[PDB]
Scaffold this active site. Sequence first.
Site, PDB file in Angstrom:
ATOM      1  N   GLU A  78       0.902  -1.166   0.000  1.00 26.46           N
ATOM      2  CA  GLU A  78       0.000   0.000   0.000  1.00 26.46           C
ATOM      3  C   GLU A  78       0.938   1.212   0.000  1.00 26.46           C
ATOM      4  OE1 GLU A  78      -1.878   0.943   3.811  1.00 26.46           O
ATOM      5  OE2 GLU A  78      -3.769   1.266   2.740  1.00 26.46           O
ATOM      6  N   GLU A 169      -7.830  10.931   3.324  1.00 22.52           N
ATOM      7  CA  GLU A 169      -8.060   9.925   4.280  1.00 22.52           C
ATOM      8  C   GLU A 169      -8.165  10.665   5.635  1.00 22.52           C
ATOM      9  OE1 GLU A 169      -5.094   6.784   4.643  1.00 22.52           O
ATOM     10  OE2 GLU A 169      -6.175   5.888   6.234  1.00 22.52           O
TER      11      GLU A 169
END
Length: 182
Positions: A78, A169
């Site tokens: 990621e 985020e």
Amino acid sequence: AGINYVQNYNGNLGDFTYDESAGTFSMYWEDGVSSDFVVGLGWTTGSSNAITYSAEYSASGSSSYLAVYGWVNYPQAEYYIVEDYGDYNPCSSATSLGTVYSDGSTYQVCTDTRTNEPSITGTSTFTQYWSVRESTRTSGTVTVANHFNFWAQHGFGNSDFNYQVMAVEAWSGAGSASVTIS
């Protein structure tokens, strides 16, 4: 832009609007959140092309990032290229890889291993790679290739990409974002 993917991980924890053909999205979490969301727009397959964006981003009370975000399928990883963030720097805590210079600034680079955490195959163990911009900003061009090429010296697979988005985020606190990808 040629946007063909919409990123929505727990977007319903706030107010997420977007328009694929215009390349724009907004995300409002004025009331705060106490769980992780990741929202944004991008492509079903990542590449090393440059991304240009423009945003208003307000998250100084929030554990949040304004970032290029995506995955590599194998080895599973990621990754984030963090252009601006709130109260939490992920590299304070993680293992340092050095510094890369790109698009007007140095970035601190680091990596971490996450074990049995939500991932693109469900729950699994994967590596994270982070570049965190030293002079934070909310608009400009990210020459992704410069980050990929540096991380690749440290095990980043640099091919076999899954999705890649310009994202916001947050997992705590409150704030507000509006982003255009050009």
